[PDB]
Design a protein around this ligand. Sequence first.
Ligand SMILES: Cc1c(Oc2ccccc2OCCn2ccc(=O)[nH]c2=O)cc(N(C)C(=O)CF)c2ccc(C#N)cc12
Lengths: 547, 401
Amino acid sequence: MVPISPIETVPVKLKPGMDGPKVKQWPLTEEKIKALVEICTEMEKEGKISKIGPENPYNTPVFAIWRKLVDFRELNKRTQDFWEVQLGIPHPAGLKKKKSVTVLDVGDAYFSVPLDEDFRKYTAFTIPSINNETPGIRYQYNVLPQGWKGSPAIFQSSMTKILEPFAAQNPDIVICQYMDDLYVGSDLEIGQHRTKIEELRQHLLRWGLTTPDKKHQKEPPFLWMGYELHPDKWTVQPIVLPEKDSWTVNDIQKLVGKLNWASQIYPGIKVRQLSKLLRGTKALTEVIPLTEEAELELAENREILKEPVHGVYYDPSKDLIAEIQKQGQGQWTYQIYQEPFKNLKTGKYARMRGAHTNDVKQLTEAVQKITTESIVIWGKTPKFKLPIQKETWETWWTEYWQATWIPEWEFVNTPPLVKLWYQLEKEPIVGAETFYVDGAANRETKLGKAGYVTNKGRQKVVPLTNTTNQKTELQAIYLALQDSGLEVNIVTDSQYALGIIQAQPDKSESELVNQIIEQLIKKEKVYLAWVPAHKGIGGNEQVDKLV
Amino acid sequence: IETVPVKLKPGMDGPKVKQWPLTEEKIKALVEICTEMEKEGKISKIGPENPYNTPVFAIKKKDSTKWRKLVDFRELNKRTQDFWGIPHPAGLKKKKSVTVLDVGDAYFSVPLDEDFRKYTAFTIPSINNETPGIRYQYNVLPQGWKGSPAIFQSSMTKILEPFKKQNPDIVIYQYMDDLYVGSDLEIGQHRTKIEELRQHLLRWYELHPDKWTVQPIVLPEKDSWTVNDIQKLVGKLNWASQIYPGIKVRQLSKLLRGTKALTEVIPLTEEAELELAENREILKEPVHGVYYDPSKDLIAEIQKQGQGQWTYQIYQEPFKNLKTGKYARMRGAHTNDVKQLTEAVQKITTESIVIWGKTPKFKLPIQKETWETWWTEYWQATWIPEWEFVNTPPLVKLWYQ
Ligand SMILES: Cc1c(Oc2ccccc2OCCn2ccc(=O)[nH]c2=O)cc(N(C)C(=O)CF)c2ccc(C#N)cc12
């Protein structure tokens, strides 16, 4: 016999203060007991388990579905935390094309990784006796049991330590671990590739681990995690949009799942209205009627999802490019690619929940998201193509009160273009009329007034019902914008309105803010000045609107 | 040569912080660095039985092309038991000049407590989540951990004993991996003395706090005032009255009576001139009842003033500023707001370390996603302060300009 190299064991403990499991075994039928006795006898003959005495006070229930199945949920609750087997799923767009990709089945190694001796006693389980007239058979595991909390991580670390020297001394290949399967890709000749595959089977055999000499069942195209992986391209598994007369909540969640999933390669997917219907429902069986906007959106989706679209694999010798387009209603879409017309992947970004916003902030957020995703998938920031003029971005970030930055980018003339819709003056305007505005409201009756007085003697006070102080301050500014020329100076004491306007929004929840924005767009020059309230600043008329 | 027993605070588990993504160049640099450190026994690979994690990344300090390894020990420093202390040198900020030295390498010669090493676990990530990452733990005192200067303190005193006995006029302070050396000599004599100290430590950043002062509130001096000038003056005085009690604005607001055009010149009445002069005299005095409390957090607020200019205020209570300053330095960041902000945060943190011996909590005028996306690209210090994000434009910005 050739001496097998022993696999180092991982020291495992229970959670602090807790103790091993002690769960009562369910009574089983005679045939199930016989089946489990045969199975456990074979497994003991192979070395996976060992018989134990009565001194072991721990027990874990056993079932047969035959097939033996141990319910380790209690021991899992009582087992220490392990490092994650994965910090995320790989993305097909990050894979680098290979001439050859072989799959090796290392499933038989799963029961070949020994368990920490001091921890084996916690894996005890009992086979009941026929008619319960003898003591049940007592067993404990000697290897990583299937279903135990720590089996995948310990198996993966053990396999990694075994593969480490083979991977080191063969840098011209790539070895990847996924569950009980290895994936070895290389650009060598098919003969050299198969040769090094045999070498890997040898190196794994030096630990007693057996890879089947049979041809593996997996073969192109690889179906994995909703993905199709081809020798030269990738895509998502076929997305079919159902044809439903009426749509329930679970049908809309299935549809938004299929559209969010398809959006990573199919460019132009929109999910705003369909997901908007799910707003505050929390009822899985509720049938919700379908707005016309969701019909147009869904029709555009069926048009985009008509014929298949594929993504290419990553080539590190070529630059990484990401182009962004605005879709409206806070929706943005982007494509990441290295060659024109051949995308690595696509995606979308929806604006965050906010009371006020503008297109430039949203584009910035989208660029940050794309940057993070790109660093995850490819380890580098792409060069951006953005629908915004250079001068626009310079004006924005130079005049913005916050610090902001976008990485290397270039302008692409693809409407709609992101632009600045208004810009406030830095100094008062000479020759322009000066509108001192003010608004006030009663907290009980919700009655208020909004108006202005100007330097030319122009005045206005409007009464309002069902209003608040903030609403009357905004309404006052709006009135000044309505009745003034193309150039106007505006004086207010509303820290609220100045806080809103200094954020430079172009869209808002409040229709009043939107009306103010529409007024600011039509103006040539607007200077907005703030003063403290109730300080006797003449012109500022808190008493005129408190009547 | 002997390990000191280190534990965590009662009821607190070790840090389990997610590692953020890194570029391929930083990953390769960390691979080289960590391989070399593993050869030197400073770190060791760990198995899956270690669930703890602390983020790691790589930087490039000033005047150097070599990559450096930074560990974000903020969570571990929080969860590490309090070590005991030395009163902060109140004379370090009063000294004419101070030089900062990186003494982090000395920490690697002292072993780390056996049972505590598992809490220093860190992960080199893999591109596209190929593997769960290359996992390491520290065997010696790691740079960035708060326990490293506390444990090495006795050894540091033993090394600096001859130099401190030779120059009683030089003040020496230690914070994290940095040694602050303050004196009053000439720049050349200070540099030769710094080389003397670095070769003194070998065998075992010009900073001038004297050119820094607190900034008073100033009012404009004009011969002719417009309505807008007076409105802004009244606004600024009204703001300052929250800081200074006797600020009075009724005689200046008396001029704003009537609905006049903003650009119209208004002459000052004598009552207005007198009120303005009294306000100047009041603003010439310091703030009443401004004290430091070591049991409270330091809050640092930063305002972007444009054209590479930034203002900042360090306080503990509102309107009770302990420090105010204006960072307008241009250092290869003329087109990058975030780099300027990051350098500003580093300089303010350094000043706060010199003055009070601890870092402040920043209120950054930047969106969370932008800052968290880019701040590690321009970070050069071995420590990291805490920060929050300001989403509403503050009105007081121009009152600090
Ligand atoms: C085929 C495959 C993976 O592919 C590669 C494995 C090794 C090297 C390079 C590779 O991709 C290069 C691009 N490429 C792709 C396909 C092709 O045919 N030809 C190619 O050149 C990577 C995986 N993942 C995500 C892993 O984590 C593996 F552990 C897989 C996971 C599950 C299944 C199934 N069922 C298949 C996987």
